[PDB]
Structures are given as structure tokens and as C-alpha cells.
Amino acid sequence: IVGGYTCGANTVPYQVSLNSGYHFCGGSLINSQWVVSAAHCYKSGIQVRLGEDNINVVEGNEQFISASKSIVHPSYNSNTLNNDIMLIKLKSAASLNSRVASISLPTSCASAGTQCLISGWGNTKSSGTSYPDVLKCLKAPILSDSSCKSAYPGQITSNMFCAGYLEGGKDSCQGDSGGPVVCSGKLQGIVSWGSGCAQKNKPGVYTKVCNYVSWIKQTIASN
Ligand SMILES: NCc1ccccc1
Numbered sequence: 302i303v304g305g306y307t308c309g310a311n312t313v314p315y316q317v318s319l320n321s322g323y324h325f326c327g328g329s330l331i332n333s334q335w336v337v338s339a340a341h342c343y344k345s346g347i348q349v350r351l352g353e354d355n356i357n358v359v360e361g362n363e364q365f366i367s368a369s370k371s372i373v374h375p376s377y378n379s380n381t382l383n384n385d386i387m388l389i390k391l392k393s394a395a396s397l398n399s400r401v402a403s404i405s406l407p408t409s410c411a412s413a414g415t416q417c418l419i420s421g422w423g424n425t426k427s428s429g430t431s432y433p434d435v436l437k438c439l440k441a442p443i444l445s446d447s448s449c450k451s452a453y454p455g456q457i458t459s460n461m462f463c464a465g466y467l468e469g470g471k472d473s474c475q476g477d478s479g480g481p482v483v484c485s486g487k488l489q490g491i492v493s494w495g496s497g498c499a500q501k502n503k504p505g506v507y508t509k510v511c512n513y514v515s516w517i518k519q520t521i522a523s524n
């Protein structure tokens with residue numbers, strides 16, 4: 302997250318870190334046994350880390366649970382990033398409390414102008430590299446589809462939205478991928494892609510979760 306603020310420990314209780322020896326992507330806890338992330342975060346050998354603030358220090362609220370099954374969306378296209386969404390089943394159920402909690406799936410799609418919360422452990426610089434150890438947060442609005450398509454001609458599908466600031470300075474970044482965009486208490490987006498971080502006229506692009514609720518629910522019900 303570039304241009305954000307320190308969230309505070311366990312203030313984003315649905316945020317998970319995906320770990321393969323190191324943090325590599327975010328995700329969101331959607332019930333006691335399932336996480337949603339980005340398909341482009343797929344790899345074998347995932348441990349899901351719940352209850353994290355500092356990812357390099359054991360602080361006392363963590364739960365570390367290995368994945369039993371990963372399911373990339375049937376229509377994920379790694380060249381265009383269309384359908385950039387993946388479900389991860391935990392080997393055992395997490396213990397839910399105020400500091401580790403699920404986020405609800407949306408009933409309706411959010412409109413442009415809605416303010417959302419984006420969070421992650423990704424790079425904090427637009428030029429160069431600095432990776433934080435504690436969770437960072439950013440408040441950002443959903444942009445109109447027309448602004449999004451004008452920023453990224455030929456690249457925005459109906460399964461994507463833009464959020465952020467056309468003036469730059471505040472954005473998600475590498476290492477935030479897979480993490481949540483929460484608006485009005487519901488999971489509306491997944492950190493997906495963009496051109497660089499926090500550059501003028503190049504806002505972040507997010508997977509539009511409201512298009513996937515039926516697939517998510519059906520998949521959970523049968524796996
Ligand atoms: N600035 C959007 C973004 C998010 C994740 C990875 C790359 C770029």
C-alpha cells in the first residue's frame with residue numbers, strides 16, 4: 302500500500318497472509334474454512350496465516366493453517382487477468398473471535414463513488430522498494446467505469462473495477478495482491494493489477510466480487 306496508514310493490530314480481522322516460506326499475497330477469510338484470493342497468487346504449498354499484524358513477530362493472536370485444496374476460477378485468463386479469483390480451503394476450521402473474523406459476501410454490486418478500505422503488506426513506495434512488517438490500510442473510492450476504461454483502454458472487462466485516485470500518490474502495490482477491498486462491511490474487490498503503483502492516471506484494478514457470489518457459494522457447498 303502506497304500512501305496509506307498503519308491499520309492497527311487486528312483491526313482488519315478478515316485479512317490473511319498467504320505464506321510459502323515468506324508472505325507473498327493477501328486474502329480474505331469468508332467463513333471458518335475458506336479464503337478468497339487472486340488466481341494470480343496460485344501456488345502449491347500455501348499456509349494461511351490469520352490474526353497477523355507484524356508478519357515477522359509472533360504477537361499472540363495468530364493462527365497458522367495449511368491449505369487442503371485450492372480452486373482457481375474455471376475461466377481465469379493469466380494474460381488478461383480476467384476472472385482473477387481463487388478459493389482456498391483450510392485443512393481445519395479457524396477459531397473465530399473479534400480479532401479473527403470472516404467478511405460477508407455482497408448482496409449487490411457497489412457503485413462508483415463508494416468509499417472502501419484496501420489493506421495489505423505490499424510495497425509502500427511508487428519508486429523503489431520498502432516492504433512493511435505491519436498491516437497498512439488505505440481508504441479509496443470506486444471510480445466510474447468510464448474513468449477506468451479511459452485509464453486502461455482495451456483492458457477492463459465487466460469483471461473488473463478501478464479504485465483509487467487519478468492524481469496518483471495512493472494505491473495498492475506488489476504484495477497486496479489477493480487482498481480485500483471492503484465497502485460498507487462487505488467484500489467487493491480483490492487486489493488484482495495495475496500499471497505500477499500510485500502513478501498518475503493509473504489507478505488500481507480489482508476483481509469485481511459481486512459477479513462471483515454464485516460460483517463461490519456453489520463451490521463451498523460441494524467441496
Ligand atoms: N497498483 C495496483 C497494483 C496492485 C497489485 C499489484 C500491482 C499493481
Ligand SMILES: [Ca+2]
Pocket residue numbers: 353354355356357358359360363
Ligand atoms: Ca505475527
